[PDB]
Amino acid sequence: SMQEEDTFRELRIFLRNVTHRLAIDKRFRVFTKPVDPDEVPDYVTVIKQPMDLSSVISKIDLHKYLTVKDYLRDIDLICSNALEYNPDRDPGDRLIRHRACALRDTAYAIIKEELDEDFEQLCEEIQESR
Ligand SMILES: Cc1ccc(NC(=O)CN2C(=O)NC(C)(C)C2=O)cc1S(=O)(=O)N1CCCCCC1
């Protein structure tokens, strides 16, 4: 229905706004673009599902997220990919992990404050009905 189309359009507007706020935070610059293979050739071999905030924007626009839970799975993937690829004790790796954990915690904290639980529940029920 048009009511259901209006629900998913509101979801995409909400998700673009959250993603924009993460993408403009200087701490998260490293997560804004896919890994350049000419800089990091072994990335695509080690990380089986690359994810970055530009890819999340592309996926919103392709109507790939029908719930905030599905969006948060891709934020969680950005974080787990960073922890997996940069596991060492050296400060370079520790800084990336701290930023990855901050990106995840920030996304979760925005959604906790700004997502209506009944809006998420409606999305989940339209999703389950398809
Ligand atoms: C999880 C994750 C998502 C996206 C990126 N993207 C980049 O690193 C992009 N990029 C380049 O390819 N070159 C420069 C350094 C110019 C740049 O900004 C990276 C990650 S990551 O955290 O897994 N990670 C970044 C730390 C260093 C190793 C590469 C992968």
From Swiss-Prot:
It is found in: Nucleus. Induction: Up-regulated in breast, uterus, colon, ovary, and stomach tumors. Induced in breast cancer cells overexpressing NCOA3 or treated with estrogen. Down-regulated in 5-fluorouracil-resistant derivatives of the colon cancer cell line HCT 116. Highly expressed in estrogen receptor positive breast tumors and in osteosarcoma tumors. Residues 3-114 form the Bromo domain. Residues 108-130 form a coiled coil. It comes from the Eukaryota. Belongs to the AAA ATPase family. Interacts with ESR1 and NCOA3 and these interactions are enhanced by estradiol. Interacts with acetylated lysine residues on histone H1.4, H2A, H2B and H3 (in vitro). May be a transcriptional coactivator of the nuclear receptor ESR1 required to induce the expression of a subset of estradiol target genes, such as CCND1, MYC and E2F1. May play a role in the recruitment or occupancy of CREBBP at some ESR1 target gene promoters. May be required for histone hyperacetylation. Involved in the estrogen-induced cell proliferation and cell cycle progression of breast cancer cells. This is ATPase family AAA domain-containing protein 2.
